[PDB]
Design a protein around this ligand. Structure first.
Ligand SMILES: [Zn+2]
Length: 185
């Protein structure tokens, strides 16, 4: 199957926000450009606070239809060359959270990383999660574009909200964003 990428704000009005260049986001392209393994601040915005027990899942899928059923995973080189938490095959890691769970779906084999949902930090109207992408889009992904899908879920895994963004993991994020944006224009 293929995970849904349908945007769904849900009952809590859930949606994402985003902040050399380590990571840069293009609203026009709904695309995040980032360097390998670097900190990617992704913001969780809600109109109402979900209850304790709410979880936040991040999963990558291929954007292109001809590769949608394939599991996005690290290339062999990058799986070999770690915090001891993220499985070496997982593309997406969470940085700075002592409660990240790395999961593999029993039937689809897809990877995901989940952390407990936490209300906004002081001085902020959103909750920020720091993600790291462990393989380049060019490796493997081999130039195929991917989407990161973030889902807000209850403790049993039921959907509460969904949002998503394209991601390109690359050596020069700032330059590649300009290139793709100028091309859009
Ligand atoms: Zn790689």
């Amino acid at each position: 199957s293929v995970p849904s990428q349908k945007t769904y704000q849900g009952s809590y009005g859930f949606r994402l926000g985003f902040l050399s260049v380590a990571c840069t986001y293009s609203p026009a392209l709904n695309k995040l450009f980032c360097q390998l393994a670097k900190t990617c601040p992704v913001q969780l915005w809600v109109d109402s606070t979900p209850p304790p027990g709410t979880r936040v899942r991040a999963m990558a899928i291929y954007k292109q239809s001809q590769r949608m059923t394939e599991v996005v995973r690290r290339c062999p080189h990058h799986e070999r060359c770690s915090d001891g938490l993220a499985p070496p095959q997982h593309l997406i890691r969470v940085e700075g959270n002592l409660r990240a769970e790395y999961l593999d779906d029993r039937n689809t084999f897809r990877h995901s990383v989940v952390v407990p949902y936490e209300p906004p930090e002081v001085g902020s109207d959103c909750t920020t999660i720091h993600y790291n992408y462990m393989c380049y889009s060019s490796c493997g992904m081999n130039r195929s574009p991917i989407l990161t899908i973030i889902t807000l879920e209850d403790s049993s895994g039921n959907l509460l909200g969904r949002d998503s963004f394209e991601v390109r993991v690359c050596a020069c994020p700032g330059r590649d964003r300009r290139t793709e944006e100028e091309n859009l224009r």
